[PDB]
Design a binder for these strands. Structure first.
Ligand SMILES: Nc1ncnc2c1ncn2[C@@H]1O[C@H](COP(=O)(O)OP(=O)(O)O)[C@@H](O)[C@H]1O
Ligand SMILES: [Mg+2]
Length: 399
RNA sequence: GAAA
């Protein structure tokens, strides 16, 4: 197996992408390095799968070994990493000030905005990790229903971050708060999209009253890439609902310029460039990535294999329903057209007005519909259904 | 974000 050795000076990153076919293994063999804010352990072997795009950054200097076939691999001397560090530094300063002002203190809340493929999710992740590394537990809010790093696509979610992200597997998705939107873009139903993140914000505000460390941890809010048209007023409502202190605009000067005139004067607005290592992804790639996210939801990762159950449910034992006038519930009769669709297990016990603004327990996928036997087969993360009320998502998956 |  073929090996590549890289010497990184201080403030450089090794940018590489694993091949189309094979894995690439990475090992820090000298110095200190981090991958999107998580510290690498000396001499540990991190196996990344095909098509991964990764940057290992060092503040002090590093020597790194890559084993396996790469599509690209190079050391970059210029990065915006200090910018990202300074935003974290600034956040922690606000925390101290507010803690001292509370002899309960509320941490800073930061909204990241900008178009797709600017490294927004990556920055969110760096910022969450740096807070954890500072001793804090931030709440990561994920409003991107398309490319969601917390739950399945078609959801709006939040997780309390208590551990740095796993280098390979991202953050722990333990006990998130998940709302089912049911579409991959907000433009499919914008009034429902706003209702859901408004209920996210209110729910979060109540939950943090019972948790001092989460309250002072603050929020890092990742948004989707829809910054034009109605997408724009939606950024302003999200900044309002979550009472954000800071808006970070990534690589969009007109957007930065427009928010500067509309946001309240107390809201700090910063424009940062995208990293030279962010690469543009096609729709085929993002579609494939939505699929892998679904697969992960049920089957977990290589390091943490999850073992889901495939069992039959009677149509008499459940109620199928669908949201969408934009915010009305509709009872669905079992049909062949629900095959391959995700369904959310609602926390509402009855199919009524409560379903809309209720978070969900989790998701199943309908694999078979047996109309003659009046049963469906579902793939499910647990043994028995946690709720009898099943809410439709337009997201489909072939297992 | 998603669609073409
Ligand atoms: N500095 C970097 N070097 C190499 N790859 C990167 C870097 N920053 C981000 N990436 C990769 O680029 C892709 C897009 O990044 P992402 O944060 O998802 O962008 P956005 O969320 O704005 O669409 C991801 O695969 C990510 O791992
Ligand atoms: Mg993103």
């Amino acid at each position: 197996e073929n090996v590549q050795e890289f010497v990184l000076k201080e403030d450089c990153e090794l940018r590489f992408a694993a091949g189309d076919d094979s894995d690439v293994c990475l090992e820090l063999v000298k110095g200190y390095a981090e991958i999107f804010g998580t510290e690498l352990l000396l001499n540990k072997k991190y196996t990344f799968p095909a098509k991964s795009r990764v940057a290992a950054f060092t503040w002090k200097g590093a020597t790194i070994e890559l084993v396996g076939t790469t599509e690209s691999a190079y050391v970059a001397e210029s990065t915006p990493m200090v910018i990202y560090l300074n935003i974290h530094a600034a956040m922690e300063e606000v925390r101290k000030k507010r803690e001292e002002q509370a002899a309960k203190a509320k941490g800073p809340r930061l909204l990241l905005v900008g178009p797709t493929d600017v490294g927004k999710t990556t920055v969110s992740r760096i910022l969450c990790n740096y807070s954890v590394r500072q001793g804090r537990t931030p709440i990561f809010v994920e409003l991107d229903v398309g490319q969601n790093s917390v739950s399945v696509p078609g959801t709006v979610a939040a997780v309390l971050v208590q551990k740095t992200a796993d280098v390979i597997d991202g953050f722990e998705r333990n006990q998130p708060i998940v709302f089912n939107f049911g579409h991959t873009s907000p433009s499919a139903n914008l009034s429902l999209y706003e209702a859901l993140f408004k209920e996210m914000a209110t729910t979060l505000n109540a939950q943090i009253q019972e948790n001092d460390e989460a309250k002072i941890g603050g929020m890092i809010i990742n948004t989707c890439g829809w910054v034009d048209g109605e997408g724009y007023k939606c950024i302003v409502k999200a900044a309002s609902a979550f009472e954000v202190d800071v808006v970070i605009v990534l690589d969009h000067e007109r957007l930065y310029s427009d928010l500067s005139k509309e946001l309240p004067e107390f809201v700090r607005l910063t424009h940062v460039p995208k990293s030279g290592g962010v690469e543009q992804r096609t729709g085929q790639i993002r579609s494939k990535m939505r699929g892998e996210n679904v697969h992960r939801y049920f089957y977990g990762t290589r390091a943490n294999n999850l073992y889901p159950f495939t069992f039959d449910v009677s149509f008499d034992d459940v109620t199928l329903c669908k949201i969408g006038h934009e915010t009305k519930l509709v009872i669905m009769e079992p049909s062949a057209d629900i095959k391959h669709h995700l369904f959310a297990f609602s926390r509402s016990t009855k199919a009524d007005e409560n379903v809309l603004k209720s978070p969900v327990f989790g998701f199943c996928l309908v694999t078979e519909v047996d109309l003659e036997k009046r049963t469906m087969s579902i793939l499910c993360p647990q043994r028995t259904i946690p709720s009898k009320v099943l809410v439709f998502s337009d997201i489909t998956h072939l297992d």
